[PDB]
Design an enzyme around this catalytic site. Structure first.
Site, PDB file in Angstrom:
ATOM      1  N   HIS A 250     -43.515 -14.511 125.169  1.00  0.00           N
ATOM      2  CA  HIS A 250     -43.315 -15.952 125.069  1.00  0.00           C
ATOM      3  C   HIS A 250     -42.353 -16.295 123.940  1.00  0.00           C
ATOM      4  O   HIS A 250     -42.214 -15.531 122.980  1.00  0.00           O
ATOM      5  CB  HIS A 250     -44.661 -16.662 124.865  1.00  0.00           C
ATOM      6  N   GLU A 303     -40.213  -8.371 116.121  1.00  0.00           N
ATOM      7  CA  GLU A 303     -40.840  -7.075 115.888  1.00  0.00           C
ATOM      8  C   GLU A 303     -40.142  -5.934 116.627  1.00  0.00           C
ATOM      9  O   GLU A 303     -40.255  -4.780 116.204  1.00  0.00           O
ATOM     10  CB  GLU A 303     -42.313  -7.142 116.290  1.00  0.00           C
TER      11      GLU A 303
END
Lengths: 374, 373
Positions: A250, A303
């Site tokens: 998302h 990340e």
């Protein structure tokens, strides 16, 4: 403390705990700012982490993080996070850190800087480990940035390109609003505790796997594409197998997370060997997830590129969380100092929905109490 | 993220963060209940801390807190709070504590009990200090409760009356709702971290002097009243010198704090030598404070009678914060476990009111920044 308010939601989602002047993750606008300064400007102009620490803590440039003093890490627990959590708390009595309630702002600020850079030294020492000798201080002293000193204390002779990669990463990770570890730092500070106790507690919050924001477990997938060679088909197989694609999901910002863009750029510029494959996995993963879920908004998680950059710098996967923590100390320190000036204990409430008045004798197990005592 | 709400106050006063089954500090009723059980019933019936721990954590008395295994404290920092904060965090790698996200409820409960009693053991060893040999485990093993084991590990030959004083105090201090240290424990727990990281961080918050509840620095005052003989004149002297009167202030409950009531009665029941001077100070302090601030609600702080009870048990003044921590491990553990079952990350919001977009060179000091190119 008795009745549950109409569809009260547990937790504090959307509950405003503070105003802050420190930094603005402008999700809607697609930009991250530190004291008004875009991180893209900071990173592209190669502002080193120690200087960004001061910008965030002070609100201006010019008193960068000092180098760590010699201090062999006292804790060797097998877990870098534990070593730093325990070691930081222990700085208060040996260095004479009084409670925040008892000191002025400048003293707290000096104590934050001294402790903050010692967190980095402790991480470098813990990662290097006890089964080899420490790096001599005089070799570390040849460095001209805190980031270079950290890499030298850990690896002895770090590649300067890897030092640049860590600098880009730490700045991009330095601060991000009101998450659990930043919130934990502010709650401990708000009791007037010494700053080492607040930093130590924040490391504990940061260690939880739901804290979010630690680098991604994407290296096995990047190895697969390095052997298989077909980024698209490996992505399709990762999805068909039922597995979830690491490093994607998302949207967080309006489109591209600006920390992901900055780190992708860092990896490109520094010639990270995995770059071409990762760029291919990214283009493959987004076009695949977006084609499979056309009404959902899919972007790359910071990340993902954080793992590429850290891995390039020879950071082992088991050490990537500590590297996140090292960068985030800047934001922790800024928020601790701002909390000190706020001077307001953080003490929420609860609603009791448990048993009503009753005797001890009416509680299950009471016979065992009388049998143990008897 | 940039408009301040019309109801905004700094902090989270009155903001309901959780529902809890654990305990009800009933401010307007002047009563404190653990899982429905009044602490006054728990203390007067001499329910030992180890059993109250299970009550708070489990909601029943099935499985009391176990004794600590042998484990010489590895931290000697000169501060008991730091020894246990560091020492607890270090338990997770040696004992193999996995994150709360990765274990079932029964395993977390087992881990909380094992670390909780280790916290007691660490405090006893740290308080006893490094200039004394440890007490042999065989001597500690002859004790029948956790509270007695602690006093024996610390003091070697504790007076059984002092053991009862500690059991009364620890039960009275075990749990009190959503205070800053229990809140910290829940926040860390909500990230899925291991329970030792959550306990370690809560000790950090407990150590702040504004947390509240750490026993009142009233021993100098009680000494002076014992020396001078006149409590009222001593209290008037303190306030006339503009100093703070320790142990008194705003009501926490509607009137009397029930924990203050319980500790005053424990000190009387056990024959604490300082009891009568302490009652005389309470009368003189409340009278002078209510004379001077006649429309302010002024009650005795629980910390006042805590100090008397702990001093009776020969707890030095610098050990008293850690003794509060020892009792409060029960509520921390109960709340960590409740947080685990909730499965909800605790993070609030903030509103940005800082500077708007600006270039680096527009920031004071940019000319002092060195960059490579």
């Amino acid at each position: 403390m008795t009745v549950v308010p109409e569809n009260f939601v547990p937790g504090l989602d959307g509950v405003v705990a503070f105003t802050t002047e420190i930094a603005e993750p402008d999700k809607d606008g697609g930009a991250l700012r530190y004291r008004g300064v875009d991180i893209e400007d900071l990173v592209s102009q190669r502002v080193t982490f120690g200087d960004v620490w001061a910008l965030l803590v002070d609100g201006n440039f010019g008193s960068g993080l000092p180098p760590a003093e010699p201090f062999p890490l006292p804790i060797h627990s097998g877990d870098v996070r534990v070593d730093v959590q325990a070691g930081l708390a222990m700085l208060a009595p040996i260095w004479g850190y009084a409670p925040l309630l008892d000191i002025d702002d400048a003293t707290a600020r000096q104590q934050l800087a001294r402790a903050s850079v010692m967190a980095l030294s402790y991480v470098a020492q813990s990662a290097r480990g006890i089964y080899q000798p420490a790096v001599p201080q005089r070799i570390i002293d040849e460095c001209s940035t805190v980031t270079a000193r950290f890499m030298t204390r850990w690896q002895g002779e770090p590649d300067p390109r890897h030092i640049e990669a860590i600098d880009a990463y730490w700045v991009s990770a330095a601060e991000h609003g009101m998450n659990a570890s930043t919130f934990t730092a502010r709650v401990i500070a708000s009791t007037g505790a010494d700053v080492a106790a607040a930093l130590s507690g924040a490391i504990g919050a940061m260690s939880g796997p739901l804290h979010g924001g630690a680098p991604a477990r994407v290296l096995p997938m990047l190895d697969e594409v390095e052997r298989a060679g077909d980024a698209r088909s490996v992505v399709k197989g990762i999805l068909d197998r039922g597995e979830k694609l690491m490093g994607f999901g998302h949207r967080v910002y309006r489109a591209e997370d600006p920390r992901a863009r900055v780190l992708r750029a860092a990896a490109e510029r520094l010639g990270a060997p995995r770059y071409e494959v990762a760029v291919a996995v990214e283009q493959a993963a987004l076009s695949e997830l977006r084609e499979r879920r056309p009404d959902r908004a899919i972007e790359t998680n910071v990340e993902f590129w954080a793992a590429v950059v850290l891995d390039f710098a020879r950071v082992p996967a088991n050490m990537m969380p500590a590297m996140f923590t090292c960068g985030r100390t800047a934001g922790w320190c800024a928020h601790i100092l701002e909390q000190k000036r706020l001077g307001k204990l953080v003490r929420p409430s609860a609603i009791y929905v448990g048993p009503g008045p009753r005797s001890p004798e009416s509680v299950d197990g009471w016979e065992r109490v009388l049998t143990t005592a008897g």
